[PDB]
Structures are given as C-alpha cells and as structure tokens.
Design a protein around this ligand. Structure first.
Ligand SMILES: Nc1ncnc2c1ncn2[C@@H]1O[C@H](COP(=O)(O)O)[C@@H](O)[C@H]1O
Ligand SMILES: Nc1ncnc2c1ncn2[C@@H]1O[C@H](COP(=O)(O)O)[C@@H](O)[C@H]1O
Ligand SMILES: O=C([O-])CC(=O)C(=O)O
Ligand SMILES: O=C([O-])CC(=O)C(=O)O
Lengths: 844, 844
C-alpha cells in the first residue's frame, strides 16, 4: 500500500529520465521556452504530490545515500538532468551505455577546482576580448562573430582531456562562423598575420587565394599528456560538406599509424545552426560513422545551436524538428544539450562526451545552445525580438559568479582583459602552448611544385610482373568460386601465360598488384566496387560455399602496400568528400573512387567543383584522387550513360585537374601508375568505359606493359601510307574502336585515326609528335560519340586549333546536341551511331 | 509482496514495448536474425519466470479481459508486437500517439474476411505471374524484378482505404525497382504498349525518350469511396531525389484546392534498399516534412528493405545502422517493420499507417522487409548465401495458408494464374478500375508546343501600376518597421511618385504585384528570401515592436493571386526538387527559387542536370521554374561570388532552358512576366546580381515598364555617332555598367556597348536588329567579368560567330581562366578588374 508509490515514482523517474530535458532551462536569453513543460513530466501532475516527508531509496541495494523525500529526489535530480544541461541518452538501447551515463551524471557531479575556473573565465574573456578588438580596429568586414563564447573553453578543455587520454592528433572541421576566434585563441594562429590579411595586401601563396575565414590551419599543442598535433581542415563557402572531409582526414591519420587504435586520433566537427538538420551530408556521414572501412569509432561532432537560421526566429511549429539536432537519434547516439550561461556545465559535458567516445567507440553530439549577439555582416533584423541588448555578456555573469564564489575579483578579470589586449597589440602568439613544426609531419615535402611530364619508374621487370599476375590469379581451394568468376580468373591465368591479351579488369588489378608490392598502397573505396560495377573487377572473391571472403590482393607478400577495398554505402556525395579527406592527408596511398555509373556520380558536385578542382588554386592544398567514372554511349540509358565531361572540362584552368580517357587497358595501367608514383598529386577523372570491358579488341600485350611507356596521344597503330591519306580523325573514347571497326571493315586507306588518351593538360608534345607523319593533310576532324555540347568540343579552341597545321582546317563530327546526352531508345541510338560513324569516314 | 511482481512485469512489458521488435521474426528467408534477442527482453531473463498459473490484469481498470498468466500475457503479446510485424513507436514522446497505437495494435487484431483474403492472393499471384511472364517473353532486359510481392497488395489496400477516407488524388514517387509491376498491376498501364516498348520501335513522343522503367504514369482509379486520381511521378537514373519531387507535387495539388485539407491529397514514396539510409536527400525532405509552407501533414513513405545493397550481404557490423530505416527517428515518426510472408500483416500495417497519417498529420514509415529473388540484370553472386532457391514463392505459401483456412483450393489459384496470363496475352488493361481521362485534369492543355518569341500581355496600365506600387509600399501603422526597412520603403514610395528611379527590389516586387492581381500567383520559396539574401527584398516586414509579421503582397485585394513566400530550411538540394514538383504540377503559379549565393546553389546539381534541363527532352514533361541566382565579381569571395554559368550553358540544347541576365530592373520586370504569363513553361536561370541592388545607375523609369517591352539584347542607350565608331563591346552582367562607368568617365566616342540580356535561346532577331546601326565596324569583342573558361564564351561558336558581320572579326576580353572564378584577395581583384575594363576599351 506504501510501496506502490515507491514503484510509481520509479516509473515516473524513468519517464523523467526519458523526457526531462524539455523541462530544462537551455536558452542563455530565455526564448527557447515552451509551454508544454508540465505534462506528465513532474511528480505533481499524475498521481503523486508533495507534503509527505518520507520517500525511501532504491531499497535493499546499498547506495550509501540518505534519500529522504521525492521532493528532495526531484530537487536533487532536476539539479542534474533538468538544470544547466539536458541529457538525451535514455533512448539508446545498449544498456551498458545507459548505466554508464547513469553512473556519470546522477551519482556524482564533477566539481571543478579554483584554477580551472580561473582559466575558463580567462579564456572566454580572451575570446570576447578578441572579437571586440577585431570590431575596434576593423569596423566593417566579413567577421562572423562568435559571441556565444562557450565554444572556446570547451574546445580547449576537450583538447586537454584528450591529451590526458593520449590522443596525438585531433583534427576539427567547422563551418564559417566562430572561425577566427578558434584560429586565434585555440590553435594559435599568428594574430599579426591575421590583422595583416584583414588589412590586406598579403603574399601568402602564388595561388589565387581565398577569403580569410576559409584558410584552416595546423598547429602543435602542449597538454599535460604530451604533444598534440591538431589541425583545422579547409572549407569552401558551402557549409556542412566538411565533416566527411574531416572523417576522411582521420582515417588517413589512422592508416599512417601502425594500428587503428581509434582513441589516439580524434575528429571534432563544429556544425552550423540550421545545417546539422538542414544539409543532407550529415545524414550520409553519420550513417557512414559505423560502416567498416569508414568508421573511426564515431566523432565528437558539436552543434552550435544559434537558435537562428540566418533569417529565422523561434515560433512553435516553424521549427522543422523539435530540437535543432535530432539527427543523432538516427544512430542511437547520445545527445547533450548545454547552455552557455555557465561553462562549468560545458566542461562537464565535453568531458562526458570525450569519455564516451574513447570508451564505447561511437559518435557523440554536443547541442551547444547559445545566442547570436551581432549579425553576420549587417543588422539583426529578421529575428524580431532582441532581448540581446539587455542580456549581459558571458564573461560578466561568469566573473560575477566566481566573485560570489570568492575566486576572482574585478581587478583580476580587468587585468586579464588588459593583458589580452596587450598580447593582441604585440602581435605575439596568443596561445601559450604553440610550437614550431618539424619536417617529418610535413609529409608533403617531396610532393610540391611539379609538372605532368616528369619521369616515374614505369618500366616493370617482366618476370616479377608475371609473378604478380600468377599471384593475383591463383586462388586457394578453400574459397570456392562462382562459375563466371572462375571463367574470368581462368582467362586471366591464360593472360598470365601470354596466351590471351589483357582485357580491362585483369590489367587493372594487375596495376594494383604492381603498386602494392613496391610499397605504395591503394585504397579503392567506391560505391559497390568490391566486385566492380559492371562485373569486371572481382577483387573480392566471395566464397559462395561458405560465405566468407578472400581478397587476392591482400595476400601477395608481407611488407606489401596496404590495399583495402571498401564497398561504400550509397552516398555518392559524402563518400567522395571522405575520399578527398583521405587523399589530401596521405600522399602515398593511391586513393581512387569508382562510381556506379557516369551521371550517377552527379550527387557530389560540390566536392568536385569546390574541393578537388579548386583546392590547389584557392588554398594551395594538393590532392591526387582518381575518379573512376563509367562513360559510354551503348544506349543503355539517358543517365545510365555518361558523366558530363564538360563538367570536368569547364574547370579548364592552369593544369589543375587532369582528365584522361583510357582506351586500351595498357592506358589504364600507365594512368594509374602515372597518378600513383609520379611525385605530383593532382586529380584524375578517368573515363573507365563499359563496352571495352568485354571487348575483343582490348589490345594490351604484356610487351605493352613492361617496355610500354606513358602515352597521352596514341597515333595510328595500323599500317597506312600517309601520302594518299586525305583525312585524319582525332577521337577519344570507345568511338575509336567503333571507327576502327568501320575502317578495317571497309578497308579504307586514305584516313588515319588518332586517339587522344588525355585531355585536360593540353597535350602539346604528344599531339605534334604524332602528327608530323600526317602533317600535309589539311582537313582534320574531331570525332566523338558525345553530343555537340558534350565531350571535348569546348576544349577545341584552346588547343585543337593549335595542334592543327597552318595550311589546314578542322571540322566536327559527332552527335548533334541534345539535353539528354543519350536518347533513351536503342533503335534510334544505333541508327544515329552508325550514321555518325559512316559520316566520320566520308571522303571515300 | 505479490504486487511487486505485478509492477515488475509492468516495467518489463513497458521495456518490451520499447525493444520487442528486435526479438520479432521479420526476414522472409531467415537471415536477418541476430543472437542478441534474449538480453533483458523476455520475462525469463531478469527476475521473473514461468510456472505461476497466476498473473492478474491491469487491476481496478475494467478492461473486461480474462488475463490469467504472464506466460499467457507474453504469448498473446508476442502474437501482437513480436509476431509477423514489429512496431517501432514507443520512442515518440507525444502520449496521444502512444495510446492511439496501443489502442490499435494490442487490444484488437483486425481479422480479415474471406473475400479480401481472396483478392490479396489473387493480386500478388497476378504480380508474380506478371514478372514471370515478362521473363517468359523477353529473356534479357533491364527488368528490375520485384519478387518481394508484398508491395502490390498493400499499395492497392492503402489506395482502397484512402478511397474510403476521401483522398481524391494520391501520387507516389518511387525508385527504379518494382517499377513495372506497379505500373501494370496497380495503376493499370496498357500492357500491350509496355510489351511493345520492351520489343522497341516505339513512337511515343517527338522528344528523345527515356528507358521504359523511368516513365511514370497517371491513371484514374475506382474505389468504394469514389474516383481517385492517382499518378506516378517521373524519375531519372538517380535514386532518392524523387521524394522532394513528390512532396512538391502534393503541395501543388493542395494549393489548387480551395483549402489544404491534407487528408484529401496523399503522397506515397517507395524508397530503395540502401538509399533511405544511404542518400542524404531524405534527411532534408523529412526534415522539411513539418516546416510551414512545405508540410503536407507528412507522408506514408515506404522502404523496400531488400536486405541487399546491390553488392552487400548481412554481417553484424557491416550494416551501418541497426535497422536499414532508422531515419524516421529523426522526427519522432512511427516505424513499422513488416515481413512479406503474410500480407494479412501488411494490410493491417498499411491500414494503421494510413489511419495515422490521416488522423495525427505526421509522416509514417513502412519497413517492408523482403528478399530479392533474381538480380538487377545478372547473377546473384556478391550476396553469397542463397537460401532463396529452396525458399518458396509468396503465392505458394499464402495460397497454402488459405487452403488450410478453407478458402481457396489449388483449382482456384490455378484458375487465377491462367486468367491472368490470358489477360496479359490479350493486351487488355489489367486493373479493373482504370478509367479514361477528362480534359480538365489535363491542365497543361494551353501550355504545349510554343516558342520563346510569343506575345504576352506585357503592357500595364500606368494608373493601376502606380496603385500597385502605392499598395505594396504603404504599410499600416500597427506593424512598426525597422529604420533601414523604413528608408527602403520610403524610397520606393518616392519611386511610386515618379521621384526616384526604380532600383532592383522595388521593381522586382512590383513585378510580383503586377502578377498577383491579374490572377497568376507567385510562390517564391528560396532559402532565406523572406527579406532577400542581400537585404534587398523585404517582402516580409517583421514588426520588431511586437514580433508578428506583415506581408504587403498578401493584402492587395480579395480575389488576387495566392502569393506565399517561404523561407526554406537550409536544403539547397531538396528544396529545389520541391520547387520542381510544385512547378511541374501547376503551370499557373510562377514558382521562382532564390539561392543564398551563386555557387552555394551547387548542391542541387542532380535536380538541375536531370530534372529541369532534361525534363522536356527525356519525358516530354514541361517545367517553368525560375532560378534566382546571385552572380557577381565584386570580390567578396571565391565561391560567394558566382554560380557556374557554363553549368547552365553546357546544357546547350534545342531551346530547353533559357538563361538570361537582367541588367536593368526593367529587365527583371520583363523577365518575370515573360516567364509568368507567356504560355510556355521552360526553366529560367536568372543571374540576379549583387552590386546592382545598391547601384546609382539602376536605369528603370516607370515609362520603361508601362510602354516598355520585352528586350533580349539592349543596344546602345547613349548617343554615339556610328561613323566614327571602331569598336563595339558585347557584354552581359554588371560589367556593362563597369564599362559604362569607364566609357563616360573617359568620354570615349568611337566604341559602343551592347548588352545581351538573354543568352540561351540564341537571340538572332534581337542581335541583328541592334547591329544594323553598327555593321560596318569589323572587330567586335565579347567582354565579360568572368574567367575565360567561365561565362558565355563557350556559346560563342554557336551564335556569336553568326551575329558578327561578314567582313568582320571577333576577339576576347575577360579575366584569364582560373579554377577559382574569383580570386580571394580584394586588391588583386580590383587590379585585374580595372586592367580588364581598360583593356576592353583599347583603341582610343
Ligand atoms: N595536399 C597537401 N599539399 C601540400 N601540403 C600539405 C597538403 N596537406 C597537408 N599539407 C601540409 O602539411 C602540414 C601539416 O601536416 P598534416 O597536418 O600532417 O597535413 C602543413 O604544412 C600543410 O600545409
Ligand atoms: N509539365 C507538363 N507538361 C505537359 N503535360 C503535363 C505536365 N504535367 C502533367 N502533364 C499532363 O497532365 C496529365 C495528368 O494530370 P496531372 O496528374 O494533374 O498532371 C497527363 O496527361 C500529363 O502528361
Ligand atoms: O550563409 C550560409 O551559407 C549558412 C547559413 O545560411 C546559415 O548557417 O544560417
Ligand atoms: O543502382 C543504383 O543506382 C541503386 C543501387 O545501387 C541500390 O539501390 O542498391
């Protein structure tokens, strides 16, 4: 009769552990408050009340406590769950996690000593002093004021606590706002250079530069556990694309270690206000946060919940979700709502989150709710109600709290402000732990300032090459194959014996085997490329008799290159930024990316347009990814057909990318080793075709791989007398073979065909060396199988009209331009295909 | 002593309501089973056991039940929560929803009568008979076999139950697989035409066509509640981009109703296997599923959990999330796991989901777990373990169940198969409820087959125009303005009196007012465009004294056009597909889309490349969106600067889009009414600039709007003698005014400037009519402020070299090509800016 209220308050306290966080006080100004705060939440609503003076504890379990009253229970517990911080954790089903968080945030509050309180007030006082000093000198600029002020102490506290738990390199990517404050007061960028580039006239690099709030920065940081090599990743004007970049960066920093002890490398990510729930890249990347080959045990990603949206106020249902970070209930990841009014709470919360990520290896969020004092660039209008003016600064209330706590007086905080302004006026480095950088962490020292025509050790010893073929083809008899897989491997065993010529797939993973034994690893991580998309790689043989897998490239010899294929989850726009961040933080590993189809790789456009094709000219950051893109006009579809090639050729600028179209498999051999061990890291977008995978003219002998060389522009392979030749046909892609299968079909001698295997670095030497044998002929053509807008026809005026001789002319052959690059119907497709091929060969 | 076990089993049954679904049996073949199924889940694990023969019921609450045993309790309850279906619902915090689902799925199981059982077995028997017939006639094709077979009966059951609850038009977008089965057996496409286009040689439209599994289809369906106008939206080869398209389509079908009673229009969406958790568009669109101006009360979106990922098997932690649809815990939306082994369960579940969406107005998911019998196109290899061969077909087990239920024998089901094969052999329409279509639902009847030079009633009565200005400018004195807002509105009141010329923003919402009174509504729904992105629209005046809003375009007169501005959530790639689906399902409303910046609109590339610029040529589907894109080289940033213009001009094909760059605000007036009330609906991508918003040469008199006309190519506005003129400068964008502010600065008479306000439909008449006054001059130039790759310089060979006279020449002026279109540093930016302008004016 009296224990029914005991179990009833156990029920209500469990349901108050579920949804106690919406009764909590989170807004630093007090406009996040809803009216639905007393509805089955407290004791007083349903069946219980006060004025009892008795409530016993957990009972027979010896807690050692003096729990006397349910009013005392809720008053002690609202000071834990419902106070400055809310804890959205009870929905995780893993009971070890639940009891671990119960052991942390209920039984014991981590009370801080006096010196840590002093350093928190000092550091956030320094943060707000920095931004007011920036307003003092430079009045009007793209400043992106932080003004929430809780970010700096919790960043430095989490860096200190990661130092005490041994995390040697922790990299953070973040959005545009709060940039300069973390660059100065956390990492320790040189403030005088920052004020110089505010004042402009800066000579940082020979590239085209970028605005001052995009350049991230590496630094060395001293904690009580040792040195910490912490970096800040780059960022374009787009938001929220940087978290797959930074998870790529930490997987690159984990593979350069001997062992992926995932506590030793930490990604942080600071997200925007309405972009952790706005942008769809975070769905893919925290989805990707537990997939094998992609996970780093999660990340401590932090949401600055500004309670703004660059125009939005806070009504009831104009808010798209109830909290602005509910995404972290996709995976059963804990969320922690923390205000800015008391950074004791944010220290406690980021200690809890870092302890969580280092113990149970899953991503944690930090809901950092705070306000926005000034604007982006102009007035704080479209958020109407401004309580912000009569709301005090965080250093004022926190210093007044610690003055009431008998720690720091007005003289102390005033001396801190004046010290900090003097430190900024000096131009000295602000952070007291910044160090100079040694050369070994500067791993990109042999990979700077090259041109595409360098010499790389292309020639391979033929005996070792045949041994690589016979090791990647001979498969142990435990892992039972599939019949078509067995036919492919028997055929490439015949290719190893010199019987059959190389088709595409055998030559391509032979190129993999040529890389991985010398010591240069390869990470291919495409979508669904463990077997290839067109059934033409099969680098993972599934044992269809047992179920386990065997990779015949991970068993060549010990001391090899670390080759790991990862079939991606279906991201296509945040797997590519992952392979960017893996590619720009390790120059050794040849990181290639294979889409499922051509224009199915159109999702990552921001990653192509603003990272990989603008990285060198904006930041001076190098990247050597390879984009294996399918590209074909067989007629299988309108957008199963082709990636947009001008979307990799309207980036036509100063040897930045390099698009190249391998026709022969000898070309894909030389292109992957041209990218791998050259010395320059600039992006490939290779047009890895479809019809040439199963084609009986894949002309690739093993003679063409040992003594074969790098070829950008393969001229005529047949025998033709150039005196009678009245036409040459410059054409790239499969259409050559189509033209070839019409030229030798109708034995036409007065026209030669020249392929152009590489397009973007304007092949001058390679084209003029293969046209001195066909120079006297005037009228050239540029065939293609793409439409007239598509292809490389708007690269013609750049260099096709200088490859041409003087007394000579050019004209066009190709499909006439249509919006769909391929028509959907097969009959009209082959009709205009055959008409175009028999139009390209005209003068007979 | 005996009630402690009562409250303990209440605790364990609540915790079994939370996580009872992972103990449930869901896989139709039995390879989704985990070992962590007995861990605090049942009674037997923690503190309770069997062999009691006593357990009382809820107690004093009169349930009217005979609940005798906790073993009986769990055996009755596992037959509800843990049986053929799992119910992931308890995590929603709204207690009305919880008690509603508790009232549905536990206190009563909806047992079906005999005839509904017969029609379910008949319809799925027809589905599997269809796909085996397709395999029988046509052996090798892009078939995308359904073979899970539960989708057809639950679709038709939900259509019937929506008919009984009055839903007049329900549109579904879906992925590639399961396409043809729903086209035949649900909507009722003509099967003979489907077999004809399998056989090919089809003449469906004059456009370029698309593959047979992309063309969606409209149909009229008969239920017991009335006619239902159900459509199937189009889809490119990309996946998962179609759900914002279909939510755009239902918001268009709700605004054509008088009132948005959201039960009467239903979106369904069928998602892919690894793409409801893979692709990031669903994050944005179910985020967007409760925002005002975007919500339709949610949607019943359905996940075909194939348990494949086009290569992936099912290991433990290779699965990125525990369930393949955990996304619907972003919003607190219920999820329902349903197998395929008994479509009684899927009927019960889709009735529950449709009752949920029609009652409480929030999105529901359907986790439809089922297997994949055959492949996409080739062998079922990279999923190794194939239990599928010894697993029976669904019609076999379901017919054998109902034979055991004394309903349908072997003769009955065999007669159903033979009837269905005869119906397919006839070429008759399969569905017995398909109807012909009337003309009024064919709303696009006056909007077909036009060209861009039609006449639209451009001339406006000047008195009514000035009245529109004085109504959009005069604001009632309750809604107190902001000071800069008050200065903008006072300035445009001066513009109304003919005192000040029109700048951009006053002329642009004057164009809005010109549209909305005549009867043609405008939906501008950009990101953060309720006030404009560059503070230059202010179409929502926030009362900064009270907090509520006032829109001076929603208060012109009664009987107006419905004008509704919606500030988007930060989507940029699924707000645009929403405005596509709103634009392609209502031709009346001028639906424009304003990005925050130029290349911040690069996220939606798939929506631009495969819907709006390929819609007319692939499907023959028309769309008239407008893309308000900022575009400027002030030097504010490298990618705050410009949208890629060739990314709207490498779509150069057959009058599909129309890019146009308004210089004067008179041009933006004529362009928005050129798109609005012309009669053709083809997409604009307008380059709405930045520096011209605050520019003292915004030459737009009210003379230029009443008697002003449509101008594609404005020639020289100043007075120049063409006999001495030795240069003309064709240039578009702000650079004209830059050139103008250098031409009249240095009083240079021998060079005229000609703008080209519209680029993509090759302006033949407009350019040759403005060059007959400057024809004798030979050397023309094409200035621009964009780099040499960027701009419209790879539209030059298309028509700039035919606008040119015969005895004449062209050369280039512009920025030399760089990867970043704008350099990041302001000093070198103005340096090359001034050098380029003084290079464009050379011959003096
Ligand atoms: N792709 C790259 N090209 C040139 N330098 C780089 C690249 N990535 C990193 N660095 C340099 O590497 C140093 C930092 O080391 P880490 O943090 O290991 O990349 C800095 O000097 C960076 O500029
Ligand atoms: N943008 C469009 N252009 C031409 N016809 C359309 C368009 N959108 C829908 N239709 C036609 O409208 C009919 C279906 O009506 P509704 O479902 O209301 O669009 C079909 O004949 C469609 O082809
Ligand atoms: O300006 C941007 O791109 C980001 C933005 O809209 C926001 O975070 O509110
Ligand atoms: O082939 C596609 O584009 C879709 C895909 O990978 C899947 O649904 O597994």
């Amino acid at each position: 009769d009296t224990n029914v209220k005991q179990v009833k308050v156990l029920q209500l306290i469990n349901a108050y552990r579920f949804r106690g966080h919406q009764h909590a006080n989170l807004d630093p100004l007090g406009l996040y408050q809803q009216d639905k705060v007393a509805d089955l939440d407290p004791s007083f609503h349903d069946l219980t009340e006060a004025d009892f003076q008795e409530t016993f504890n957990v009972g027979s379990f010896a807690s050692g406590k003096e729990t006397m009253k349910l009013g005392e229970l809720l008053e002690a517990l609202k000071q834990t769950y419902c106070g400055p911080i809310g804890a959205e954790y009870m929905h995780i089903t893993s009971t070890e996690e639940k009891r671990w968080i119960q052991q942390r945030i209920e039984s014991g509050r981590a009370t801080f000593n006096s010196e840590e309180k002093k350093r928190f007030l000092s550091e956030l006082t320094a943060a707000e002093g920095l931004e007011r000093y920036l307003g003092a000198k430079f009045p009007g600029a793209k400043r992106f004021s932080l003004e929430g002020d809780a970010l700096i102490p919790m960043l430095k506290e989490m860096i200190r606590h990661a130092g005490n738990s041994g995390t040697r390199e922790v990299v953070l990517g973040m959005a545009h706002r709060g940039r300069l404050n973390v660059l100065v007061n956390v990492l320790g960028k040189k403030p005088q250079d920052l004020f110089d580039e505010f004042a402009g006239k800066h000579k940082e690099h020979l590239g085209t530069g970028d605005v001052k709030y995009h350049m991230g920065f590496s630094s060395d940081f001293q904690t009580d556990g040792g040195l910490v090599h912490l970096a800040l990743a780059f960022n374009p004007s787009h938001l929220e694309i940087v978290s797959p970049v930074v998870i790529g960066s930490v997987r690159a920093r984990l593979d350069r270690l001997d062992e992926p002890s995932s506590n030793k490398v930490l990604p942080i990510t600071i997200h925007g206000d309405a972009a952790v729930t706005g942008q769809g890249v975070v769905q893919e990347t925290l989805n990707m946060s537990k997939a094998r080959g992609y996970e780093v045990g999660g990340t401590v990603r932090i949401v600055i919940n500004n309670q703004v949206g660059f125009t939005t106020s806070n009504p009831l249902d104009a808010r798209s979700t109830p909290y602005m970070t509910d995404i972290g209930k996709m995976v059963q990841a804990p969320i922690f709502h923390v205000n800015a009014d008391d950074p004791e709470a944010v220290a406690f919360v980021t200690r809890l989150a870092l302890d969580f990520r280092n113990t149970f290896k899953r991503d944690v969020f930090i809901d950092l709710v705070c306000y926005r004092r000034h604007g982006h660039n102009e007035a704080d209008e479209p958020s109407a109600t401004q309580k912000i003016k009569k709301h005090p600064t965080p250093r004022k209330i926190y210093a007044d709290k610690l003055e009431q706590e008998k720690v720091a007086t007005l003289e102390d905080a005033t001396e801190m402000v004046n010290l900090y302004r003097d430190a900024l006026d000096a131009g000295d480095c602000v952070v007291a732990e910044w160090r100079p950088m040694n050369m070994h962490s500067f791993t990109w020292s042999p990979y700077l300032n090259h041109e595409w025509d360098e010499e790389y050790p292309n020639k391979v010893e033929m005996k070792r090459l045949q041994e690589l073929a016979k090791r990647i083809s001979t498969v142990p008899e435990a892992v039972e194959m599939q019949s078509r897989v067995a036919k492919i491997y028997g055929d490439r065993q015949a290719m190893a014996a010199g019987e059959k010529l190389f088709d595409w797939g055998g030559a391509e993973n032979l190129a993999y085997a040529t890389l991985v034994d010398e010591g240069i690893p390869v990470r291919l991580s495409g979508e669904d490329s463990g077997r290839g998309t067109f059934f033409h790689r099969h680098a993972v043989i599934h044992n269809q008799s047992n179920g386990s897998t065997y990779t015949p490239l991970q068993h060549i010899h010990n001391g090899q290159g670390a080759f790991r294929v990862w079939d991606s989850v279906l991201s296509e726009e945040a797997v590519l930024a992952f392979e960017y961040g893996y590619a720009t933080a390790e120059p050794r590993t040849l990181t290639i990316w294979e889409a499922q189809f051509g224009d199915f790789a159109n999702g990552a456009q921001v990653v192509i347009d603003q990272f990989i094709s603008s990285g060198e000219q904006k930041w001076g950051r190098m990247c050597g990814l390879v984009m294996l893109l399918p590209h074909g006009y067989e007629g299988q579809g309108p957008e199963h057909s082709s990636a947009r090639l001008e979307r990799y050729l309207q980036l036509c600028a100063e040897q930045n990318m390099q698009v190249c179209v391998p026709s022969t498999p000898a070309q894909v051999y030389h292109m992957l080793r041209r990218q791998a061990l050259r010395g320059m890291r600039r992006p490939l977008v290779v047009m890895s075709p479809k019809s040439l995978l199963r084609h009986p003219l894949a002309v690739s002998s093993l003679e063409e791989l040992a003594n074969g060389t790098f070829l950008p522009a393969i001229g005529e392979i047949d025998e033709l007398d150039p005196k009678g030749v009245k036409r040459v046909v410059m054409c790239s892609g499969k259409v050559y073979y189509d033209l070839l299968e019409q030229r030798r079909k109708n034995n036409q001698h007065d026209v030669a065909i020249v392929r152009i295997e590489q397009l973007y670095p304007f092949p001058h030497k390679a084209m003029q060396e293969v046209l001195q044998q066909f120079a006297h002929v005037k009228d050239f053509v540029w065939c293609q199988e793409e439409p007239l807008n598509q292809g490389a026809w708007y690269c013609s005026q750049h260099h096709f009209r200088e490859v041409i001789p003087f007394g000579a002319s050019l004209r066009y052959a190709g499909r006439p331009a249509s919006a769909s690059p391929a028509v959907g119907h097969m009959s009209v497709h082959q009709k205009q295909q055959q008409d175009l091929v028999n139009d390209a060969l005209n003068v007979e």
